[PDB]
Structures are given as structure tokens and as C-alpha cells.
């Protein structure tokens, strides 16, 4: 899981700076989306999608995307990406950005970061808040964090 923590950091940090949210929190959702990086949509060619948010291919969206089964087994589409860069850049402009996301902004509370992406209909699972809490203040991400710095 480390090299998921260390390669995201960057582009969590640049997303959650400009969400006024600690960079730590997307890590986590991220991690509690792929399974700290175990469970990642990959292209038909073996390449990655990058979306490690699982974020879903809509109407609205124009770029790369992915097919993968859902569990009935069900095929959802999904967006693809180029780099996780390019994925945390639609993930802030989506989080950032749609109103209904609007309660996700300065938020330092992990509970309560949980609650606001539930209220911009992220995840509906009524145990996400809970879930992702426990992540973000957990001992698992803390020592891949500490793991991740240059300095101590």
C-alpha cells in the first residue's frame, strides 16, 4: 500500500489545497475505494484507468472509459484517465466545483468530510461516513503518512 500512498500524495495534496481539506482525507478515500490501490479499474489492454475513486462515466462525460462489472453481476462505465494527476483534476473540479458537493470545502473533521461527500451523493451506503472515518483517523494510514514524508 505504500507505493499507493506515496504516489497519490502529490495529487491529493494539490486537489485537498484547493478544496481546503487536509490531503490525508482524499488519500483515505481513495484507499477505502481500491483497497489501499489492491482494487483498481483496469483497461481492456491491461492498462490502469487511474480512477480511483470509481467515479462513473455519465452523459455529461466526454473522455476515456472503462467498463467493469459491478455486483447480480452488472457492466457500469466508468471514466478513465491518463495519469492519477488527470484523475484528482476531475476530482477537484467535481467536488469542487457541483453545488451539491458544496459541504466538502473546508472541512477538517474526517467524520464530517464523510458526511459532505455523502450529502453530494458520492457513496449512499449508509455506513460510508463511518467507514471512511476510520481510515482517515486510523493507525494504517497514519504509519503509511509518517512512512511517506521526507522528514520526521
Known amino acids: 500500500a505504500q ?6 500524495w502529490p495529487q491529493a495534496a494539490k486537489a485537498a489545497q484547493s478544496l481546503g481539506v487536509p490531503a490525508h482525507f482524499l488519500v483515505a478515500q ?10 483498481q479499474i483496469r483497461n481492456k489492454d491491461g492498462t490502469p484507468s487511474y ?8 452523459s455529461n462525460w466526454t473522455g ?23 484523475a ?25 468530510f464523510a458526511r459532505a461527500l455523502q450529502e453530494g451523493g458520492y457513496a449512499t451506503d449508509p455506513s460510508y461516513a463511518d467507514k471512511l472515518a476510520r481510515v482517515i ?4 494510514l497514519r504509519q503509511r503518512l509518517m512512512a511517506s514524508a521526507a522528514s520526521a
Do not use: C, M
Open 3 to 8: 507505493a499507493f500512498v506515496d504516489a497519490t
Open 30 to 39: 481513495a484507499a477505502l475505494a481500491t483497497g489501499w490501490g489492491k482494487s
Open 51 to 58: 480512477n480511483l475513486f470509481n467515479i462513473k462515466a455519465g
Open 64 to 86: 476515456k472509459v472503462v467498463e467493469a462489472r459491478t455486483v447480480k453481476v452488472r457492466v457500469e462505465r466508468f471514466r478513465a484517465y491518463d495519469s492519477y494527476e488527470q
Open 88 to 112: 484528482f483534476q476531475d476530482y477537484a473540479d467535481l467536488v469542487g466545483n457541483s453545488p451539491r458537493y458544496a459541504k466538502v470545502a473546508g472541512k477538517t473533521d474526517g467524520h464530517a
Open 137 to 140: 483517523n486510523g493507525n494504517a
